[PDB]
Design a binder for these strands. Structure first.
Ligand SMILES: Nc1nc2c(ncn2[C@H]2C[C@H](O)[C@@H](COP(=O)(O)OP(=O)(O)OP(=O)(O)O)O2)c(=O)[nH]1
Length: 627
DNA sequence: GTCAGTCAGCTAGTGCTGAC
DNA sequence: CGTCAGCACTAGCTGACTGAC
C-alpha cells in the first residue's frame, strides 16, 4: 500500500492518513539583517481541531536538513522544549524526539535517530546554551536530565509545572499533567489519548508525532497566561529562585553518591550473625518455640502469658516504645526491644540497598522532588536518603569516588535564625551578634547560671525546649513531647515554669504566637513570599509554615549559587537532606572548594536575611561518615 | 455421564501496628 | 507529625469434592 508508505522516505508511516504535505513561504531574517524569502516544507492535518493551539511541524532529517532553517531562532526571547524518550530510566534510554516551539512559527521537531551528523544539532545547542533565551519545559527535570546526559547544555528554564503548583498553594495535590493545566488555564482540550504508543521503532506514525507537536506548541500561550498571574501575586521572586534549582537537582541525580560494596557486605555478615544469635536468645526467653518473633499480637500474647506487668501491676496492652520505654525493668523486654531495633535496621537498610545499587557503576541514584513536600522542602524518593539510619554512623559505607574528597557544610541553627528575622525580637539579635548560640542563651535563662557554665547536659534541655515552644506547643503537651521523644523528663509544675520563663523574655515569640492565633487566616506567607492555603485554621501548621519555608528557600538559593561558582574546578553536588550540602571534588583543589562553599552559602544567607549573620560549620571528610 | 452447591486457596483490600 | 513496610482478618472469586435421582 502506497497510502501508508506515502511519505515513508521521511521515516514516517502514514497509518491513519489525515495529513498533507505543504511547501509555502517563510520570511526569515538573514544574518546581515536582510529579509530573505526562504521556503520550507511543512506537513499539516487534513482534519482540523476546534482549538487555536498550533499543530504544524517540520521534520528535519539528515537528508532533509537545510542551513536556512537555523535562521528562525534569531532574535527570539523564549521557546518551548518537549523531549520524547524511549523510556523512564535515563541512564539506559535514548532521546527520541526534541521539539522547539518558536512563536508565530511551526514546531521544529528533530528526528534524532535519523540525524547522523553533528553539524545539525549544534544549531539547537547554541540556542540551548545562551542564557538570554528563556526555555519552557513541562516537568523540566526529566528533559534536563536526559539532555545533560546526552551531551547538551541548557541554561534557562521556565517550568510551567512549578508556576502552576505554586499557584495551586497545595490545595489540590493531583491533576497537574499538561492537559490539566491547559484545561484550567486555556479552555482547550489537548486529547492526550495516546496510550504510550510504541516509540523504540524507527518508523513513527502520523497521529503520534502530530499530537506530540501540540503538547510542545501550547506551552507558549500557557506561559503568556502564567507570567501575568505569577506577577499579579508578587510571587516573582519565588518562581525566579525555584526555576534555577532544577539544574542543581539534575546534577545531583546524574552524579549520585557511590556505595562501598565490600563494607556493605561485611556489615551484612556481622549484623546477620548478631540477628541470628539474638533471635535465638529471644526465642529461648519467650519460653515457647512456635512464636513468630515479628508479629506484634503474637509477641504481645507471649509476654502476657509470661506475666509481664507494669509498675502498677497491670498487664501490658501495647508494645509501643512510648509505652515500653517505662518498662525497662523486665529482662526479656530489653532483648525484645534490641531484637526489634535490629530487625528494623536490617530490613530497612541492608536488604534494601542491594536492590537500588547499579552494578554497572556501583552508584546509588535517588529521585528528588522539590514542591512535593507541604513546606516545600526536598524529599528523597525511591531510596529515601532522608531515611538512612544515623546509628553506628552507617554513612561510612558511602564514600566519594576513587580519588576525590567529600567537603560537607551545614547551617548552624538556621531555623531559630529565621525565627529571629521574622519575629524581630531584640534579645535574640543581641545574643546572636554577641556570638552566643540561642541554645546556650535558653539554657542560661532556664538555669540562671553564669554564661560559660552551660554544659552539654544542661544545654540538652535548652536544645529540646527551644524547638518545643518556638512553634507554639502546648505546655500541658510538653510532658508528652518530653517523656516519649528526645531525652527530657519533667512534671506539670516545671512545665508551667519553663513555659512562663521562655515567653517572659522572648517577647517576639509571644507576640508572633498571639497574632498568628488571632488572625486565623486561610493563607500564610514566607519571606520568599511563597503562598499556601490551609483547608481550615490549625495552630501548629500556621506557625511552622513560614520559618521552615524560608529555611528551605535559603538552601535553594545556596544550591543555585554553588552551581554557579563550582564550575571552575569541575565540582559536583552530591546530596542534601536537612540543611546540609555535600559536594565532591578531585584532590589538590580542596583549599579552594572550602572557600567557594562558604562564600556561596554566605551570599545565599545575605540575600534573604539582613539583620542577623549566618554561621556555617564546615568540615572535610574522607567519607560521609566522618565525625 | 453429568452438573449444581457447598467446600475451599488465593487475591485483594482496609485496619492496625511499630520504627529515627 | 509526616513514610514506608509488614502483618492478621475479613470478604469475594474461580475449580474440586461430593450428592443426587
Ligand atoms: N523528633 C523529630 N525529629 C524530626 C522531625 N522532623 C525532622 N526531624 C529530624 C531531622 C532534623 O534534621 C532533626 C533536628 O535536629 P538537627 O539534626 O537539625 O540538629 P542541630 O542542627 O541542632 O545540630 P547540633 O545542635 O549542631 O548538633 O530532627 C520531627 O517532626 N520530629
Amino acid at each position: 500500500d502506497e497510502i501508508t508508505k506515502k511519505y515513508i522516505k521521511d521515516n514516517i508511516i502514514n497509518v491513519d492518513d489525515n495529513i498533507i504535505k505543504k511547501k509555502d513561504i517563510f520570511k526569515l531574517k538573514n544574518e546581515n539583517n536582510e529579509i530573505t524569502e526562504c521556503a520550507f516544507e511543512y506537513f499539516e492535518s487534513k482534519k482540523k481541531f476546534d482549538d487555536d493551539i498550533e499543530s504544524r511541524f517540520f521534520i528535519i532529517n539528515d537528508n532533509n536538513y537545510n542551513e536556512n532553517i537555523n535562521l528562525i531562532y534569531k532574535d527570539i526571547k523564549y521557546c518551548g522544549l518537549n523531549i520524547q524518550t524511549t523510556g523512564l530510566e535515563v541512564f539506559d534510554e535514548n532521546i527520541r524526539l526534541i521539539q522547539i516551539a518558536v512563536e508565530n512559527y511551526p514546531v521544529i521537531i528533530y528526528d534524532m535517530f535519523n540525524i547522523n551528523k553533528k553539524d545539525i544539532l549544534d544549531g539547537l545547542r547554541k540556542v540551548l546554551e545562551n542564557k538570554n533565551i528563556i526555555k519552557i519545559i513541562q516537568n523540566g527535570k526529566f528533559d534536563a536530565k536526559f539532555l545533560l546526559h546526552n551531551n547538551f547544555k541548557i541554561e534557562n528554564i521556565f517550568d510551567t509545572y512549578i508556576a502552576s503548583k505554586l499557584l495551586d498553594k497545595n490545595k489540590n495535590m493531583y491533576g497537574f499533567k499538561l492537559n490539566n493545566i491547559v484545561e484550567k488555564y486555556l479552555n482547550v482540550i489537548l486529547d492526550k489519548q495516546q496510550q504510550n504508543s510504541v516509540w523504540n521503532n524507527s518508523l513513527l506514525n502520523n497521529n503520534q508525532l502530530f499530537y506530540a507537536a501540540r503538547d510542545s506548541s501550547c506551552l507558549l500561550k500557557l506561559y503568556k497566561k502564567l507570567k501575568e498571574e505569577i506577577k499579579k501575586e508578587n510571587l516573582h521572586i519565588v518562581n525566579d529562585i525555584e526555576n534555577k534549582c532544577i539544574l542543581p537537582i539534575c546534577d545531583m541525580e546524574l552524579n549520585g553518591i557511590k556505595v562501598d560494596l565490600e563494607n556493605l557486605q561485611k556489615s551484612t555478615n556481622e549484623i546477620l550473625n548478631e540477628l541470628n544469635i539474638e533471635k535465638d536468645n529471644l526465642k529461648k526467653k519467650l519460653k515457647d518455640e512456635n512464636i513468630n518473633v515479628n508479629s506484634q499480637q503474637q509477641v504481645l500474647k507471649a509476654l502476657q502469658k509470661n506475666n509481664v506487668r507494669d509498675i502498677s501491676n497491670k498487664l501490658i496492652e501495647n508494645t509501643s516504645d512510648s509505652n515500653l520505654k517505662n518498662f525497662l525493668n523486665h529482662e526479656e523486654i530489653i532483648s525484645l526491644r534490641n531484637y526489634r531495633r535490629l530487625y528494623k535496621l536490617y530490613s530497612a537498610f541492608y536488604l534494601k540497598l542491594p536492590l537500588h545499587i547499579n552494578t554497572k557503576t556501583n552508584k546509588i541514584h535517588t529521585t528528588f522532588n522539590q514542591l512535593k513536600t507541604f513546606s516545600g522542602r526536598f524529599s528523597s524518593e525511591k531510596p529515601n536518603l532522608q531515611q538512612i539510619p544515623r546509628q553506628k554512623n552507617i554513612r561510612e559505607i558511602f564514600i566519594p569516588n576513587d580519588n576525590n574528597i567529600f567537603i560537607i557544610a551545614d547551617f548552624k541553627q538556621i531555623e531559630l535564625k529565621i525565627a529571629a528575622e521574622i519575629t524581630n525580637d531584640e534579645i535574640m539579635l543581641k545574643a546572636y551578634n554577641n556570638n552566643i548560640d540561642l541554645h546556650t542563651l535558653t539554657a542560661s535563662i532556664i538555669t540562671k547560671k553564669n554564661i560559660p557554665d552551660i554544659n552539654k547536659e544542661d544545654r540538652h534541655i535548652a536544645k529540646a525546649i527551644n524547638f518545643g515552644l518556638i512553634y507554639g506547643m502546648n505546655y500541658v503537651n510538653l510532658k508528652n513531647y518530653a517523656n516519649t521523644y528526645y531525652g527530657l523528663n519533667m512534671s506539670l509544675d516545671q512545665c508551667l515554669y519553663f513555659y512562663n520563663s521562655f515567653f517572659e523574655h522572648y517577647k517576639g515569640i509571644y507576640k508572633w504566637h498571639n497574632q498568628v492565633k488571632q488572625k486565623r487566616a486561610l493563607q500564610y506567607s514566607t519571606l520568599s513570599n511563597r503562598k499556601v492555603i490551609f483547608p481550615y485554621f490549625s495552630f501548629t501548621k500556621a506557625l511552622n509554615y513560614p520559618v521552615q519555608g524560608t529555611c528551605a528557600d535559603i538552601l535553594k538559593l545556596a544550591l543555585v549559587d554553588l552551581y554557579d561558582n563550582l564550575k571552575d574546578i569541575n565540582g559536583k553536588i552530591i546530596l542534601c537532606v536537612h540543611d546540609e550540602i555535600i559536594i565532591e571534588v578531585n584532590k589538590k583543589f580542596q583549599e579552594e572548594a572550602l572557600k567557594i562553599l562558604v562564600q556561596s552559602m554566605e551570599n545565599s544567607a545575605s540575600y534573604f536575611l539582613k539583620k542577623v549573620k549566618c554561621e556555617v560549620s564546615v568540615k572535610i571528610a574522607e567519607n560521609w561518615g566522618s565525625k
